Structure formats: structure tokens, C-alpha cells
């Protein structure tokens, strides 16, 4: 009956809470208290990239630490080179209300997705100067928030109707559908070893999913409002999440609970995007008013501040070898710090 | 010059040419948002403004006085709308459509107006407001089967505004009720305004033909009041 099911659910929740409190013998901020801080870190814009017309919504670093992508709400996907700050390719999108983009792991395709429940995939080596369109993956009821490529023939998508999905491009039909959420989802990242991934939605929830089985392996709580950014720590055994109440947190999977918390007493502006460093020592976040903040990911302190924007920060990424950091905001300018 | 620099310069030049061409086209066209209720009658004015000419969003285009307008109707989404409105924080105006003939839902429509008005990312956009289905309200209050006082008390203590203009030759009670509703909306509109954004109420019914012109005039006033604050 319904009452018996509710009682069983409450008892299992009590059991899980007791189990999670059993192994909470320490906190991250207590063990790494004696690690030498990186000190004062400042970075002057080395190149300044211009050309857009409106808000900037997504940005992904190429496999080479040389190429770049930018994606805006005026109807533009621009493929950049960062050395000579030269524009290499321009692709006019079909839909303009678009919120995600990505490179292929071998630098051959790109993908984009917007409010229309569609993920459009283009290929780069084409005889025409155009980057032609080759695929459209469809089957959601809502809007897409992010998309990443496991390899050149298996991709992953998350939408705002409680679901996630794994897809095989050549045929164009889901292989497995990931359900178990309650609200709309915002961001997923792929495991370094390419076997799992994780997801966060607008609840107090983030989940760790296997890929080829479909069964959901872990569930995490903690946040007071929606969730806006997530990624992978390099060894594929941690993550950090940011929320729309001005708070970041850091979890480790096997511990199955939050380890450390990033907050300040005078921040009342939320978070938009987050990324890690290539050595596991810089955590870089874009906040709600006009700033980016670079954090030392083991101390919950502020290593440095990045300014120069006249509006909100929404995109942040690091190179594939430690060469720069790109930030993008509603002021229509990307900036490359080194 | 080496080949690499040749290719880089040619590519950057061509792409900058294209983007410079596209700037004017992006700035030439105006963008609007459309909100309303299920019984409100959105599609009615959508057809009336198409006269002026699966998927998660729908588009409509029209042309008034050599100026183009794009409306973005939202369908095939869910009933939580606190995340896909954020992307509409750079548009000229919001068309809010409400019905004037059902007292069980007028409070909900008022709450919707309250919610849109006080939003952080929407504190710079004007609201054009359409009261619709007036004839049904007239028939309802003329029949007298049920009273507006059943749901709205202070109607027992209200006199017609001194600047009310009942042109078509209507009964006084019709004018009383109309101005009661309009004052209910404008009370919210003037409670916390700050000279940046203003409402623009209107009176219309399902058989109107002059809605896009009203949108035109409010948009013109908005653009004018914007220039006189960035230059002078």
C-alpha cells in the first residue's frame, strides 16, 4: 500500500543518513590546512578576442591547446585560433536560443543544442568552406543544457525534462535513457576514463551514472537551490558543483558525501559555470555580477580575482596543457588570461 | 610571409567581413516576448498579428511602418518557467494577455503580473498589457446572475474615475467594472516603479484590429526614453 511504501522510504532514508554519517570522520578543509597557499595570483589579458554581438553562452577548448570555439545568441558559432587571434571558421546556427557546444575528442566534429529539443552535429573536414551539417538527434521534450562526446560515435545529452540519454550517431536512436530525477537538468561531464558520467538538476540532487547499463549508481544531496555547473577532477574520482545561491562544494564519489564548501560572507550573487585546472590546483568560477574568481581547490580561500567585464560571466575553460584560461560574459568579449 | 600567415590573414579578413555585414541585420529587427494563459486568448491576437505579416518554441513575424517585429511564443515546455525566461533579458517589451470575464482566475493573472514585474533580469523591460473579452464581462454584469463583489469586496466603495472616457455609450456599471480591473493592475504597476520601466494598459476585445499599432507606439516611447538617458 501507499502508507507501507512511504514508511519503507522513510526508514531507508534514515538508514542511508546513518550510513553517510558513519564515515564522516574528517573534513577536507581540516586535512589540507597546512598546504602552502598559491599566494597572490594575477593574470593580465594577453589576447582580447572580439567580434560577437550579444550574450555568450558556451565555450569549449579543443583537443589541441591551440584551437577554440565560441557560441553566441546572435546566431553564431565561431571557430577561433588563439595564437594569432584569427577567425578560422564561422557557422550560422539555425536556432538562436542555444545553450551548449563541444568539440569531438579527435577534432573532427562539433555539436550544438538549444531551446528546441534538438542536437545538431557538424563535421569539420569538408570540401566547402562551410562546416556542413550532417546529423540531428531528436527525441527530447524540453530543452537541452549540455552535450559531450565519448568518442566519434557515442555521445551524451542532458535535457530539462528529468532525463539524460546516450546516443549512437550513425543510426540515430537512444541506446539507454537515464531517469530518476525530478526537476530539469543543467550540466554533465564525461569521465576521464570514458566509462561513466555525472549529472545535476534543479533540486538538491546530483547523480553518478554508469553508461552501458543505464542503472544509476549514486545519488548526492546538499544544496539549497538549483545546480548550475559541474565537471570532472582529472583522476575521475571527484567533482565540484556550484549552485544558484552563491555556494560551491566538493565531493568524492567513494565517500558518498560532500567534502568541502566554498563560500564567502559577502557574496549574494550566484554562480554560472565552473572548471578545473590541469594539475588539480586551480578551480575557476564565473559569478553573477561582473567577475570571475580563481580558487585554490584545497583551502576554500580566494587565490585571485579576474575583472574586466561589464555584465555577467557565463563561460570558463582551461587549455589542455596549462597554457591559458578563457572567460566569456554577456558583454560580447572573450578574454584569454595567461 | 610564410604560408601559415597567408592563410591566417585571409581567413580572419573574410570572417571579419561577414560579421561586419551581419551587425546591421542583427540591430535592424526588434524582438518581443509573449506571455498569457491557457484560456487567455494568446492565439487570437497571434492570428490578428499574423494578419499584420514537438518543437520547443514558435516564431511569428510582422512589419509595421517599415520596422520588423519578431514574437517568440513558448510551447512544448514544462510548467516551471524560472530558467528559460532569463534568456529574454534583452528584448524591447512583453505582451501580457489577460481575460476580463472570469473572477476565479483574475487573482492568478494578477500574481503572474506581479511575478514578471519584479524580476531581477527583467527590471528594464516595459509591459504592454491586453485586457480581453470585454463583451463577456458586460453581459455577465448586465445579467446580474453573480456579483463581482462575491470575489472582490471593495467594489462596494468605488466611484468611476473622473478621467474615465466611456465613449461607445455604455451603461455606467460596465465602466465601473472595467476601471476596477484596470486600477487593480495599475496599482501593482505604480507600487514600485522607478522611471526605468512602465506599464501601458489597454482595452480590447476578441474582434479588435488595432493591436500592433499600440505595440508600435509603446515601443517608440520606450526607445525615445532610452536615448534621452544615455546621451543627456
Amino acid at each position, epitope marked *: 500500500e501507499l502508507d507501507q511504501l512511504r514508511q519503507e522510504a522513510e526508514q531507508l532514508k534514515n538508514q542511508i543518513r546513518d550510513a553517510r554519517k558513519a564515515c564522516a570522520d574528517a573534513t577536507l578543509s581540516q586535512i589540507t590546512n597546512n598546504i602552502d597557499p598559491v599566494g597572490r595570483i594575477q593574470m593580465r589579458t594577453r589576447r582580447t578576442l572580439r567580434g560577437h554581438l550579444a550574450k555568450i553562452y558556451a565555450m569549449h577548448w579543443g583537443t589541441d591547446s591551440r584551437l577554440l570555439v565560441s557560441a553566441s545568441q546572435d546566431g553564431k558559432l565561431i571557430i577561433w585560433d588563439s595564437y594569432t587571434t584569427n577567425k578560422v571558421h564561422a557557422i550560422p546556427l539555425r536556432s538562436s536560443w542555444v545553450m551548449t557546444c563541444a568539440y569531438a575528442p579527435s577534432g573532427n566534429y562539433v555539436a550544438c543544442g538549444g531551446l528546441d529539443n534538438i542536437c545538431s552535429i557538424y563535421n569539420l573536414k569538408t570540401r566547402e568552406g562551410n562546416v556542413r551539417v550532417s546529423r540531428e538527434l531528436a527525441g527530447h521534450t524540453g530543452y537541452l543544457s549540455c552535450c559531450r562526446f565519448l568518442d566519434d560515435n557515442q555521445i551524451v545529452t542532458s535535457s530539462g525534462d528529468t532525463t539524460c540519454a546516450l546516443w549512437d550517431i550513425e543510426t540515430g536512436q537512444q541506446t539507454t535513457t537515464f531517469t530518476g530525477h*525530478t*526537476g530539469d537538468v543543467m550540466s554533465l561531464s564525461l569521465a576521464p576514463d570514458t566509462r561513466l558520467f555525472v549529472s545535476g538538476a*534543479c*533540486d*538538491a*540532487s546530483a547523480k553518478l551514472w554508469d553508461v552501458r547499463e543505464g542503472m544509476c549508481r549514486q545519488t548526492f*544531496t546538499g544544496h*539549497e*537551490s*538549483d545546480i548550475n555547473a559541474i565537471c570532472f577532477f582529472p583522476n575521475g574520482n571527484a567533482f565540484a558543483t556550484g549552485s*544558484d*545561491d552563491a555556494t560551491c562544494r566538493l565531493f568524492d564519489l567513494r565517500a558518498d558525501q560532500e567534502l568541502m564548501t566554498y563560500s564567502h560572507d559577502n557574496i*549574494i550573487c550566484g554562480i554560472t559555470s565552473v572548471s578545473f585546472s590541469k594539475s588539480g590546483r586551480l578551480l575557476l568560477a564565473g559569478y553573477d555580477d561582473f567577475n570571475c574568481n580563481v580558487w585554490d581547490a584545497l583551502k576554500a580561500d580566494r587565490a585571485g580575482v579576474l575583472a574586466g567585464h561589464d555584465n555577467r560571466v557565463s563561460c570558463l575553460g582551461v587549455t589542455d596543457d596549462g597554457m591559458a584560461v578563457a572567460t566569456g560574459s554577456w558583454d560580447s568579449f572573450l578574454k584569454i588570461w595567461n | 610571409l610564410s604560408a601559415e600567415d597567408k592563410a591566417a590573414v585571409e581567413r580572419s579578413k573574410m570572417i571579419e567581413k561577414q560579421l561586419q555585414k551581419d551587425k546591421q541585420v542583427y540591430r535592424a529587427t526588434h524582438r518581443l516576448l509573449l506571455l498569457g494563459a491557457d484560456n487567455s486568448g494568446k492565439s487570437t491576437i497571434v492570428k490578428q498579428m499574423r494578419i499584420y505579416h514537438t518543437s520547443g518554441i514558435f516564431e511569428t513575424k510582422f512589419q509595421v511602418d517599415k520596422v520588423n517585429f519578431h514574437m517568440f511564443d513558448v510551447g512544448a515546455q514544462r*510548467d*516551471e*518557467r*524560472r530558467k528559460w525566461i532569463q534568456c529574454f533579458n534583452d528584448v524591447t517589451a512583453i505582451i501580457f494577455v489577460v481575460d476580463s470575464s472570469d473572477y*476565479n482566475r483574475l*487573482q*492568478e493573472a494578477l*500574481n503572474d503580473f*506581479k*511575478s*514578471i*514585474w*519584479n*524580476n*531581477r533580469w527583467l527590471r528594464t523591460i516595459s509591459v504592454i498589457l491586453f485586457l480581453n473579452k470585454q463583451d463577456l464581462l458586460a453581459e455577465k454584469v448586465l445579467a446580474g446572475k453573480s456579483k463581482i463583489e462575491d*470575489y*472582490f*469586496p471593495e467594489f462596494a466603495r468605488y466611484t468611476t474615475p473622473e478621467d474615465a472616457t466611456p465613449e461607445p455609450g455604455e451603461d455606467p456599471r460596465v465602466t465601473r467594472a472595467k476601471y476596477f480591473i484596470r486600477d487593480e493592475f495599475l496599482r501593482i504597476s505604480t507600487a514600485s516603479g522607478d522611471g526605468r520601466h512602465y506599464c501601458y494598459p489597454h482595452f480590447t476585445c476578441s474582434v479588435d484590429t488595432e493591436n500592433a499599432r499600440r505595440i508600435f507606439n509603446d515601443c517608440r516611447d520606450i526607445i525615445q526614453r532610452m536615448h534621452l538617458r544615455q546621451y543627456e
Partner: nanobody
Amino acid sequence: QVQLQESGGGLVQPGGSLRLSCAASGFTFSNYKMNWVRQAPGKGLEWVSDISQSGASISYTGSVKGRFTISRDNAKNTLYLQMNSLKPEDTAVYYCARCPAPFTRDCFDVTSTTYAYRGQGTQVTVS
């Protein structure tokens, strides 16, 4: 996570005074706008009352313009509705709704079909 639990249902004949309470846990309740919504049998979701951060701004509904009271405690973390003289047209179940975001005055989607931050409901039948 998010906990909203109601209290104060029952059945009564017309002319009764009741006290609906809703307790919250799982956030800092000092700075969140709150509301009361209800659903009557066979009806949808309709809004009853609203109250802001500190307690200086109070608002109600015309249908209940003279009968009800909306109060709150930011120390006992509880939202209250108070009723004095009821009607047979008020049989429903009551939910207390939290606002989505903190530190802000606009409030979206508390009347939605499914909502992450809404309680279970309490039954009130007057006949």
C-alpha cells in the same frame, strides 16, 4: 534535503475557527519569501496568500479578504494561516510553498503541478 510538513486538518460545520501550520527544514528560513496554496476536490491549484521576507508586507485574496490571517516565524521556521468563520465552499487540502531563489522579491512557479520545494498537504473539510 527539502522538508515541508503541514498540520491542522479536520472536518467542521460552518462557523469554525482553525489554525493551519506548515513547518520547514532544510535551508536558512530567515530570508525566503513564502506562500499558501490550496487544492479543492475536483479543482486545480489556486493561490491563497503571500508574505515577504521580514513581515512588513502582507497580502491576501479577495475571496478571503476579511476572514484569514497570514503570519510567520523566522525563529520557529513556520508559516501560519489563521481562520475564524468558515464556509462549506472551503473544503480543500493546503500546501505551503517556498520561493525558488534567495534574497529576492519575485517568486515563480509555486502553483506548479510538480515542484521541488512544496510540502505534502493538510486536509480541511467544512460541512
